[PDB]
Amino acid sequence: TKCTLKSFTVEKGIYQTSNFRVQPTESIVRFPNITNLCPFGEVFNATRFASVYAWNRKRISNCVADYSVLYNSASFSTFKCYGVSPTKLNDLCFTNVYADSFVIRGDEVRQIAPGQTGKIADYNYKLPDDFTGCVIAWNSNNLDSKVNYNYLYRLFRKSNLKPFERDISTEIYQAGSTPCNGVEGFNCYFPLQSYGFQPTNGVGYQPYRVVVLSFELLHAPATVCGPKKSTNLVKNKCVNFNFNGLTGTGVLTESNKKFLPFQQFGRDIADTTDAVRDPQTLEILDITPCSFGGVSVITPGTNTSNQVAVLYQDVNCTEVSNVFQTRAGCLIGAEHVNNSYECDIPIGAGICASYQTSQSIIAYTMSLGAENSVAYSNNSIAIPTNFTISVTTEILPVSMTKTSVDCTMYICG
Amino acid sequence: AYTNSFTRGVYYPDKVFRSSVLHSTQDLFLPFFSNVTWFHPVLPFNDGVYFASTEKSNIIRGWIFGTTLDSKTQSLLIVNNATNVVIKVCFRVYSNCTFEYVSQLREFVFKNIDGYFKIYSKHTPINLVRDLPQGFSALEPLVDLPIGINITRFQTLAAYYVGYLQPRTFLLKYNENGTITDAVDCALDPLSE
Amino acid sequence: DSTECSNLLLQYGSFCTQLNRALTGIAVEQDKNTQEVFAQVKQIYKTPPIKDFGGFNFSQILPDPSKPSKRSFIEDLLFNKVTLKFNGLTVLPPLLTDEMIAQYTSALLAGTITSGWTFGAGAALQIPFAMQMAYRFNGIGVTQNVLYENQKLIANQFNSAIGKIQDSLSSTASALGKLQDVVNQNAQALNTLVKQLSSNFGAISSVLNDILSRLDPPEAEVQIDRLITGRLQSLQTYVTQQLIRAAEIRASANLAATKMSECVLGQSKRVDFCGKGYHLMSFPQSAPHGVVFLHVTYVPAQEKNFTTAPAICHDGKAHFPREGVFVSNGTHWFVTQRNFYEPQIITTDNTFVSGNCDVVIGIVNNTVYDP
Amino acid sequence: QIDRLITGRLQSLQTYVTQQLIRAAEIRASANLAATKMSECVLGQSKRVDFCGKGYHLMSFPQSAPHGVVFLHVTYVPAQEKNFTTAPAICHDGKAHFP
Amino acid sequence: DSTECSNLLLQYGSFCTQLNRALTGIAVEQDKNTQEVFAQVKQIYKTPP
Ligand SMILES: *[C@@]1(O)O[C@H](CO)[C@]2(O[C@@]3(O[C@H](CO)[C@@]4(O[C@]5(O[C@H](CO)[C@@H](O)[C@]6(O[C@@]7(O[C@H](CO)[C@@H](O)[C@H](O)[C@@H]7O)O6)[C@@H]5O)O4)[C@H](O)[C@H]3NC(C)=O)O2)[C@H](O)[C@H]1NC(C)=O
Ligand SMILES: CC(=O)N[C@H]1[C@H](O)O[C@H](CO)[C@]2(O[C@@]3(O[C@H](CO)[C@@]4(O[C@]5(O[C@H](CO)[C@@H](O)[C@]6(O[C@@]7(O[C@H](CO)[C@@H](O)[C@H](O)[C@@H]7O)O6)[C@@H]5O)O4)[C@H](O)[C@H]3NC(C)=O)O2)[C@@H]1O
Ligand SMILES: *[C@@]1(O)O[C@H](CO)[C@]2(O[C@@]3(O[C@H](CO)[C@]4(O[C@@]5(O[C@H](CO)[C@@H](O)[C@H](O)[C@@H]5O)O4)[C@H](O)[C@H]3NC(C)=O)O2)[C@H](O)[C@H]1NC(C)=O
Ligand SMILES: CC(=O)N[C@@H]1[C@@H](O)[C@H](O[C@]2(O)O[C@H](CO)[C@]3(O[C@@]4(O[C@H](CO)[C@@H](O)[C@H](O)[C@@H]4O)O3)[C@H](O)[C@H]2NC(C)=O)[C@@H](CO)O[C@H]1O
Ligand SMILES: *[C@@]1(O)O[C@H](CO)[C@]2(O[C@@]3(O[C@H](CO)[C@@H](O)[C@H](O)[C@H]3NC(C)=O)O2)[C@H](O)[C@H]1NC(C)=O
Ligand SMILES: *[C@@]1(O)O[C@H](CO)[C@]2(O[C@@]3(O[C@H](CO)[C@@H](O)[C@H](O)[C@H]3NC(C)=O)O2)[C@H](O)[C@H]1NC(C)=O
Ligand SMILES: *[C@@]1(O)O[C@H](CO)[C@]2(O[C@@]3(O[C@H](CO)[C@@H](O)[C@H](O)[C@H]3NC(C)=O)O2)[C@H](O)[C@H]1NC(C)=O
Ligand SMILES: CC(=O)N[C@H]1[C@H](O)O[C@H](CO)[C@]2(O[C@@]3(O[C@H](CO)[C@@H](O)[C@H](O)[C@H]3NC(C)=O)O2)[C@@H]1O
Ligand SMILES: CC(=O)N[C@H]1[C@H](O)O[C@H](CO)[C@]2(O[C@@]3(O[C@H](CO)[C@@H](O)[C@H](O)[C@H]3NC(C)=O)O2)[C@@H]1O
Ligand SMILES: CC(=O)N[C@H]1[C@H](O)O[C@H](CO)[C@]2(O[C@@]3(O[C@H](CO)[C@@H](O)[C@H](O)[C@H]3NC(C)=O)O2)[C@@H]1O
Ligand SMILES: *[C@@]1(O)O[C@H](CO)[C@@H](O)[C@H](O)[C@H]1NC(C)=O
Ligand SMILES: *[C@@]1(O)O[C@H](CO)[C@@H](O)[C@H](O)[C@H]1NC(C)=O
Ligand SMILES: *[C@@]1(O)O[C@H](CO)[C@@H](O)[C@H](O)[C@H]1NC(C)=O
Ligand SMILES: CC(=O)N[C@@H]1[C@@H](O)[C@H](O)[C@@H](CO)O[C@H]1O
């Protein structure tokens, strides 16, 4: 109070020294059951893949993608993501998600990247320079090598592929001046070859299954979002909570109010969230702002003594010498007496505090005045037999200081 | 063969719950006493549309929404069926699938807001035929799909009223339960104003 | 409870210590108002056990022990007539509880019933209520015998008049208009203050956690600044509205204190200050946020036309009335008090003599009987 | 930057002058009350009770204060009361006598 | 009478409603003032001819 009054001596009175709000503990989050999940399984564990010239594209939509299954797996040779963090998109959404799967060989996995050139990058599968997505590959020698699958790749093309372009035409490539007649010949070659996937090949010559996830994030609706962690709830404890994207701090309690089967969270008045139904258990809870109120000291004046009695307004003080509950809050450090005196320091709710003898601060229900019953009777009169003249002082302010503020010199100078 | 849209035709604006309070909402609504075009075909979708149909033998089936409906661009194709209702972005009537959803007087309110399709339905024990009596009801059983196109056709496949929503504020009274017992239309009348 | 907003608010300055100081000022002013209005009695006065106030009946306005609140019947009626902790807003309880205010009014009422106006001057000196009512009739100009000769009738009029108030309060709606308006105004102010939070104020979103979450701190600072300036403006507006309305209610409270003093504690000659008609006495009742005064006034009725004269010219001298007015019923002249027609034979005792006949205009010849 | 400073300082000056107007209205109410007291309690004797001191007003004197006025109200306070039996009238010779 | 300005003004909140309410309160108070000062007489009195 010496601080907030800017003095080393404060007079007898009650000063609102600060404010007190119970701080929340163990914040909780809740989100409905993850019943629908994204079909990354039918993409990655597909029994048969596709030739790289006719690479397969799978559009992912209207699902929740748990990308942790992908990067927590220990069965990948390469997991190169470009312009996106796979560990950071489980609370992210995308307007469009593509999944491209095909088969190449070892020394060609390095071509599935922006700004690369080669047989695969120029004539089979091309990624853009600003590619946003992941390139996932793993060895598939145990599946795509026997001693009966037939994987193909394109040899020639009259021009390089645009990003995400797919050429499946089997027309004869014309390398020279003479024009082919849909038939192979001099300076005329069939454009597709098969891979020679022998189980005894070198590592760089064995087949590798590749999945290319690509993402788009425009100012447009989105349907691919990852999972959302959820935890247990609490009761009667001021907590920061997240219910279905709604963040708020309060005490959650049981509520007798019934929502309707479609209503999620309710507002009693003035657009303030007062009730909310949890998405998991389909149960309604009432939110009450956890106790807060001004803290104000009661001091008899510094020169009288240094004792103080704290008053935490409108706080049922089951929480932070003798602690006395009053209808104006909680009183810490003030003895409660049964007798009553004239009000000295107004606490509130018909209670006043004062410094009296040993030498303690006492709080009491103020006495309105002395009690007397003047003796009325139908034939009794009380006549004055003497008098006292009395001069009393009435003090009245009549004027102020005539201050004048130069607007321009004060504002600018 | 027009017929005044009566008080009926109001839906719950948002998910929130309100108990015994009056609220003012500003979004698409069906005007009070606005002569809807009773059909006994072809129907446009300038904006959100209130569709109300009465069938003793439940002849009417789902709504074939479409921006063009020329097989050039994706449709919406709400249909309904004894076991389930099926809706796909893709029988006798026909015309790059993006999304499919299958789940479970007859008030129906359909609107497209920022690419989200919203449906509001209600079932009533009608006792007088060929007139929709002025009364109050609403619910929001809906399916949301992010199409992002402006639908312009209905082609419902035995008569149905159809009215057009407009962006005018309403004052909705709320029951103790949280249901919308009553409402008034701000620009309908100076008294309601 | 947002830290970055806390810092951006801190840099604005001492606006909030100033707003808190204004609000606490009006808060303590309210307690001062109530205490000034009601605490005009030095010591609470118990009423005698048996009520025999000369036929007058005060059961309605006197406290009933049966009621737990220990307030009078009309006070409970007035309480029922009116119909009276979200985010940083708190309502401090009034220093004087409603029961204490009821006790104040009970003390004042017992004092005015038993001791008349003596208790306001000093020690409470008791007079039989009939004799006190006679005092008050002398105050309004009517002689005291008028009360004693008509004491039963006056008692019946007062009792029935108090009875009418119960019907007026219980049945007629919106009787307590001003007090209900005070309650509604305060509720309106707090409600609009809370509504301002939802307002966007030109930022990307109103909810502060959301604006924090989905922007970088350098950019989010600007939007948070717009929210802060808007909310601070709304709060400043609420504080200044409260200051002006508190000034108005302080004026009304000072008026109530003056009426409590000048009308309950004593009889007042200021016409129309307390009721319509010559003021006899007044009783205080405690309403929820204010005081209700029952003004007992004396209004004359059933007037009669008379022929009057300024002075009576007898034996060559002009006799003027001492306190009455000469009135003639057509053939005889009498002296009557102006406020009540009670004729008396014109005599030298009740008519003083000054001057002679010729000077004063309008005088009439008659005989002034000499005892 | 000067725009921000101008806006802030202008808001502060505005709230200062508004609070000054309200405080001046309060002081004007007080000054009108003091003028009424000086006219009805010093320039004359006042019958309106507790307007000038507790008790029946005899007179009052003004004294100059720094920013106001201090009235000394001289009032007559009855004391040393005695009980008596009382009656409204007196019957004598079949006539009622009132004081 | 510009819609572009009015839509931006909607964001600020209930400021215009508050100002309108304050001004209309002052307006009715003025009629109350004149009524309280001058309407002290129940019935119009005419001086004799
Ligand atoms: C009226 O109603 O009230 C006034 C109150 O002011 C009353 O006047 C007081 O009368 C007292 C009784 O005579 C007076 O007390 C004595 O004064 C003399 C001086 O004249 C003084 O010597 C006296 O003390 C001696 O006697 C006392 C008591 O025996 C003893 O204790 C002392 O030790 C000493 O031996 O002292 C008394 O003090 O008392 C007051 O002075 C006097 N007050 C004033 C202001 O004059 O006046 C009226 O008498 C009273 N009238 C009626 C009709 O009751
Ligand atoms: C309303 C009323 O009744 N007023 C009376 C009042 O009650 O009593 C007064 C006392 O008597 C009364 O004054 C009298 O007034 C008369 C009218 O003026 C007065 O009559 C004259 O007075 C003249 C003044 O001396 C006198 O010269 C006068 O007489 C002459 O005129 C008359 C006609 O008027 C002739 O008949 C006479 O023969 C003579 O020629 O005389 C009248 O006498 O009449 C009376 O004198 C007044 N009386 C007194 C005592 O002064 O005043 C009043 O009218
Ligand atoms: C819901 O929001 O609103 C309804 C209608 O206003 C509300 O329904 C009524 O509620 C009463 C008290 O709960 C009910 O009283 C009881 O009914 C029992 C049988 O249903 C009966 O055995 C009891 O003795 C008692 O009378 O009273 C009404 O029956 C009930 N009306 C019905 C069911 O039609 O309904 C309902 O309470 C309210 N929801 C909540 C959670 O309060
Ligand atoms: C107590 C008492 O008896 N007072 C009377 C007083 O009533 C009376 O004055 C009237 O009383 O005044 C009315 C004016 O409304 C007056 O009446 C008129 O009557 C004519 C027709 O007769 C109408 O055309 C007029 O419009 C008007 O109403 O009535 C008339 O002067 C009195 N009415 C009565 C006596 O009924 C005065 C008269 O001098 O006398 C007082 O003693
Ligand atoms: C949620 O997705 O999964 C919960 C896990 O079982 C489900 O919780 C069950 O709810 C039923 C409903 O009555 C209770 O009977 C079970 O005891 C309860 N079991 C557990 C372990 O909580 O909880 C919950 O219903 C389900 N919610 C949805 C919307 O699918
Ligand atoms: C205080 O002043 O008044 C209390 C009145 O309730 C007093 O509390 C009572 O004390 C008696 C005697 O000890 C007990 O028999 C009662 O049960 C008890 N009642 C309650 C409600 O506590 O309490 C209390 O003792 C008294 N204290 C002092 C210091 O006088
Ligand atoms: C007045 O003349 O008579 C009253 C009744 O005898 C008197 O009031 C009582 O006085 C006695 C003694 O002081 C007290 O013990 C009683 O409590 C008191 N009240 C009653 C009996 O109801 O009242 C009164 O004091 C007396 N006045 C004077 C000035 O003597
Ligand atoms: C009489 C009947 O059940 N008709 C169809 C009904 O109205 O809708 C479902 C749509 O779910 C229909 O069944 C579907 O038929 C296709 C074609 O073989 C299958 O691919 C779907 O799995 C199947 N769906 C279901 C839920 O059975 O059935 C009915 O033919
Ligand atoms: C002495 C006396 O009779 N006092 C009456 C007082 O002045 O008014 C009340 C209110 O009417 C009176 O109390 C009621 O009296 C009637 C008898 O006519 C009873 O029937 C009522 O029950 C009783 N109480 C009420 C609340 O009406 O009381 C006093 O009798
Ligand atoms: C016109 C008229 O009747 N005037 C009366 C007047 O107003 O009052 C007097 C006094 O009462 C009145 O005169 C007295 O009336 C009573 C009636 O009971 C008679 O008994 C008296 O004899 C009579 N005369 C007196 C008292 O001298 O006169 C007028 O009649
Ligand atoms: C499955 O086929 O693919 C999953 C990736 O989506 C993978 O995590 C899982 O292990 C595979 N299932 C198996 C190996 O049984
Ligand atoms: C004050 O309370 O204490 C002072 C000593 O520290 C003392 O000098 C001063 O007189 C005291 N004030 C009062 C009013 O007693
Ligand atoms: C107190 O606030 O809480 C206690 C437990 O929560 C409860 O027993 C007690 O009655 C409460 N008291 C008040 C005054 O609220
Ligand atoms: C020609 C055409 O419109 N093709 C669209 C494509 O633009 C869209 O991104 C995709 C989404 O599933 O659906 C295809 O049918």
Numbering used by the authors:
A (entry chain A): 272 to 418, 421 to 593, 613 to 649, 662 to 717
B (entry chain C): 1 to 40, 56 to 105, 131 to 135, 139 to 147, 163 to 215, 237 to 272
C (entry chain C): 719 to 802, 828 to 1114
D (entry chain A): 965 to 1063
E (entry chain B): 566 to 614
Sentences from the paper on this structure:
SARS-CoV-2 infects target cells through the interaction of the viral spike (S) protein with cell receptors. In the following, we describe the analysis of SARS-CoV-2 spike stabilized in the prefusion state by two proline substitutions in S2 (S-2P). Using a new consensus-based image-processing approach together with principal component analysis, the flexibility and conformational dynamics of the SARS-CoV-2 spike in the prefusion state have been analysed. These studies revealed concerted motions involving the receptor-binding domain (RBD), N-terminal domain, and subdomains 1 and 2 around the previously characterized 1-RBD-up state, which have been modeled as elastic deformations.
The original images that were part of the ensemble map went through a ‘consensus classification’ procedure aimed at separating them into two algorithmically stable classes. Essentially, and as described in more detail in Section 2, we performed two independent classifications, further selecting those particles that were consistently together throughout the two classifications. The number of images in each class was reduced to 45 000 in one case and 21 000 in the other, with global FSC-based resolutions of 3.1 and 3.3 Å, respectively. Using maximum-likelihood-based classification, we have obtained two maps that are projected at the extremes of the main principal component on which flexible fitting from the ensemble map has been performed. However, these extreme maps have an intrinsic blurring in the most flexible areas, since for any class that we may define the images come from a continuum of states and are therefore heterogeneous. The open and closed structures depict a clear and concerted movement of the ‘thumb’ formed by the RBD and sub­domains 1 and 2 (SD1 and SD2) and the NTD of an adjacent chain. Within the approximation to modeling that a flexible fitting represents, we can appreciate two hinge movements of the RBD–SD1–SD2 domains: one located between amino acids 318–326 and 588–595 that produces most of the displacement, and the other between amino acids 330–335 and 527–531 that accompanies a less pronounced ‘up’ movement of the RBD. Additionally, the approach taken to define the two algorithmically stable ‘classes’ has clearly partitioned the data set according to the main axis of variance, PC1, since the projections of the maps of these classes fall almost exclusively along PC1 and are located towards the extremes of the image-projection cloud.
